[PDB]
Amino acid sequence: MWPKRLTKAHWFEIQHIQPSPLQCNRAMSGINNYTQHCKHQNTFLHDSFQNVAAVCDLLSIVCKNRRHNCHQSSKPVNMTDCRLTSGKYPQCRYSAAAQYKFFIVACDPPQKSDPPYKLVPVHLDSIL
Select the binding partner of residue 40 from Cl ion, Na ion, Zn ion, none (C-beta < 5 to 8 A, by kind).
Zn ion
The verdict on whether 46 is a catalytic residue reads no
| Packing angle, helices 24-35 and 8-16, rounded to 10 | 150
| Count, residues near Na ion per rule CB under 5 A | 4
CA atoms within 13 A on the CB side of 21: 2
Assess 72 for contact with Na ion (CB under 5 A): yes
Query: What's the CA dihedral at 42, 47, 49, 54 to 10 degrees?
Result: -110
What is the identity of the amino acid at 111? Q
Q: Which is nearer to Cl ion, 19 or 90 (CB)?
A: 19
Instruction: Detail the residues annotated as belonging to a binding site for substrate.
Output: 39-43, 64, 83
Instruction: Please report, as ranges, the residues that interact with Zn ion according to CB under 5 A.
Output: 40
Which positions touch Na ion (CB under 5 A)?
Answer: 19, 46, 58, 72
**Catalytic residue numbers, as ranges:** 16, 123
